[PDB]
Structure 1
Amino acid sequence: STGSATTTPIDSLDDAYITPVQIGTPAQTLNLDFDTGSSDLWVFSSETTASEVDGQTIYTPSKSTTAKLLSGATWSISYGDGSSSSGDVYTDTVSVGGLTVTGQAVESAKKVSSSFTEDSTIDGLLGLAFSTLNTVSPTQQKTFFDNAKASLDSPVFTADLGYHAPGTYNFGFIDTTAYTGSITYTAVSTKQGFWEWTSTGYAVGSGTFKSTSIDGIADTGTTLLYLPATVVSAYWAQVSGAKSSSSVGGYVFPCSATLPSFTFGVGSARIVIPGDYIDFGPISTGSSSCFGGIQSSAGIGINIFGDVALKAAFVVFNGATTPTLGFASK
């Protein structure tokens, strides 16, 4: 089997991407944030504290003939921005782009933190990291991909995120029309539960390539590109007036700037992020200070190849017995 679904930016800055997912019988369609950095499929629901729901579409298990309470199971998760959610668990039928999994753990939120409530466009998350990170207790649950894998034509999914435009998540096949040139594959460590790999270096604008190993994760659920302070300083030094602002929480730059591109290495291959992708607009409405899309990972504990990086590539998440990651230009 295969599946193919369109993923769409939630706003004009590509702050996140949503993908329609069918849950239950008859189908209840929710728009979920596909997140290769976590491993829980959770949704706003009829159980979510009413004051914490503001415009989201909710899953109502009592209206699904295939829903079953997973008795005794609870979940609780927190993300890198300090946001969080928790609740109980149902099993139900879940379909993405025509690919159906029966018996998928659908984690129903009883509570969500403020930044989820305030995001009216995101109805929940669909985790695509390794199932070892799943938070369900006392019986850990499998991701949608893990459950689908054996049925897929090939044990892979691909992320093709757009810049200010829709893109695609495919399951079970590689669309050879969706990228240019060849795909370069690189090794993955699953030791921390992530799609963790080592970039071979970087360049800023038209500058020379610096060969240096940068360990990080391919994370569709993180908006920005978070890299070591040395790398990030070298980038922003090429933008007149750019500075790190403690008050804003990262590098800002004059909105009048033309940002240079940023290149990262994948083996001997190179992915170029255009300068436009690095612009996250005014820090507050009407400001002439703009927020940068490349930020320091210092104090995060890990480097993160988030959407800013991934949307410059066609990315293969190869879930074979020994997982790997592939990147192509597009």
Structure 2
Amino acid sequence: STGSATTTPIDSLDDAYITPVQIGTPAQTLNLDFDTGSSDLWVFSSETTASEVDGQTIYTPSKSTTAKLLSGATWSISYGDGSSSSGDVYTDTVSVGGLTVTGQAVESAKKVSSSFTEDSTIDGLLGLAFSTLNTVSPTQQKTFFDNAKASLDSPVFTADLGYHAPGTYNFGFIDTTAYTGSITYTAVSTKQGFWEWTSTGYAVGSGTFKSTSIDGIADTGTTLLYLPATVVSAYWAQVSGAKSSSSVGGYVFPCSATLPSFTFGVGSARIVIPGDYIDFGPISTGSSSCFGGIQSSAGIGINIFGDVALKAAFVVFNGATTPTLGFASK
């Protein structure tokens, strides 16, 4: 089997991407944030505290003839941005882009933190990291990909995120028309439950490539590119007037600037992030200070190849017995 679904930016900045997902019988379609940095499929629901729902579409298990309470199971998750959610668990039929999993754990939110309530466009998350990170207790549950894997034509999914445009998540096949050149594959460590890999270096604009190992995670659920402070300083030093602002929470730059590109290495290959991808717009409405898309990972404890980086590539998440990642230009 295969599946193919379009993923759409939630706003004009590409702050996140939503993908329609069918849950239950008859189908209830919710727009979920596919997150290769976590491993829970959770949804706003008829059980979510009413004051914490503000415009999201909810899953109502009582209206699904295939929903079953997973008795005794609870979940609770906290994300790197400080947001969180928790609740109980149903199993139900879940389909993505024509690919169907029966008996998928659907984690129904009883509580969500303010940032989820305040984002009316995201109805929940669909985790695509390794199932060892799933938070369901006392019986850990499998991700949608883990459940689908054995049925797929090939044990892979691909992320093809757009810049200020829709893109595609494919399951079970590699669309050879969706990228240019060849795909360069690189080793993955699953020891932390992430799609963790080592970039071979970077360049800023037209500058020379610096060969240096940068361990980090391929994380579709993180907006920005978080790299070591040395790398990030070298980037922003090429932008007149850019500075790190403790009050804003990262590097800012004059909105009048033209940003240089940023290149990262994948083996001997190179992925180029155009400068425009690094502009996250005014820090507050009408400001001439703009927020940078490359930020320091110091204090986060891990480097994160988020959407800013991934959207410059066609990315293969290879879930073979020994997982690997593939990157191609596009």
TM-score, scaled to structure 2: 1.00
What SS does the corresponding residue of 2:276 show, helix, strand or coil?
helix
Q: CA deviation at 1:107?
A: 0.0
What SS does the corresponding residue of 1:75 show, helix, strand or coil?
strand
Q: CA deviation at 1:57?
A: 0.1
Q: CA deviation at 1:227?
A: 0.1
Q: CA deviation at 1:124?
A: 0.1
Cα offsets for 1:289-320 (capped at 9, x unmatched): 00000000000000000000000000000000
Q: CA deviation at 1:111?
A: 0.1
Cα offsets for 1:95-131 (capped at 9, x unmatched): 0000000000000000000000000000000000000
What SS does the corresponding residue of 2:148 show, helix, strand or coil?
helix
Identical columns (%): 100
Distance 1:98 1:78 in 2: 30
Q: CA deviation at 1:31?
A: 0.1
Cα offsets for 1:60-85 (capped at 9, x unmatched): 00000000000000000000110000
Structure 1 runs of 4+ off > 3 angstroms? Answer: none
State yes or no: 1:229 paired with 2:229.
yes
What SS does the corresponding residue of 2:158 show, helix, strand or coil?
strand
Q: CA deviation at 1:149?
A: 0.1
Q: CA deviation at 1:86?
A: 0.1
Q: CA deviation at 1:270?
A: 0.1
Distance 2:80 2:322 in 1: 27
Q: CA RMSD in A?
A: 0.1
Distance 1:143 1:153 in 2: 18
Cα offsets for 1:232-280 (capped at 9, x unmatched): 0000000000000000000000000000000000000000000000000
Cα offsets for 1:191-231 (capped at 9, x unmatched): 00000000000000000000000000000000000000000
Cα offsets for 1:14-45 (capped at 9, x unmatched): 00000000000000000000000000000000
Distance 1:117 1:207 in 2: 43
Distance 2:221 2:282 in 1: 22
* Runs of 5+ unmatched residues, structure 1: none
What SS does the corresponding residue of 1:213 show, helix, strand or coil?
strand
Cα offsets for 1:123-143 (capped at 9, x unmatched): 000000000000000000000
Distance 2:14 2:31 in 1: 15
Q: CA deviation at 1:12?
A: 0.1
Q: CA deviation at 1:89?
A: 0.1
Distance 1:78 1:174 in 2: 32
What SS does the corresponding residue of 2:150 show, helix, strand or coil?
helix
Distance 1:252 1:195 in 2: 29
Cα offsets for 1:143-172 (capped at 9, x unmatched): 000000000000000000000000000000
Matches within 5 A, 1:97-176: 97-176=97-176
Distance 1:250 1:199 in 2: 23
Distance 2:283 2:294 in 1: 14
Distance 1:98 1:84 in 2: 30
Q: CA deviation at 1:326?
A: 0.0
Distance 1:243 1:297 in 2: 16
What SS does the corresponding residue of 1:88 show, helix, strand or coil?
strand
TM-score, scaled to structure 1: 1.00
Distance 2:298 2:90 in 1: 38
Distance 1:256 1:28 in 2: 45
Distance 1:37 1:55 in 2: 25
Distance 2:279 2:82 in 1: 23
Distance 1:82 1:184 in 2: 34
Distance 2:299 2:110 in 1: 30
Cross-structure match for 2:64: 64
Q: CA deviation at 1:58?
A: 0.1
Distance 1:81 1:35 in 2: 13
* Runs of 5+ unmatched residues, structure 2: none
What SS does the corresponding residue of 1:235 show, helix, strand or coil?
helix
Distance 1:83 1:325 in 2: 28
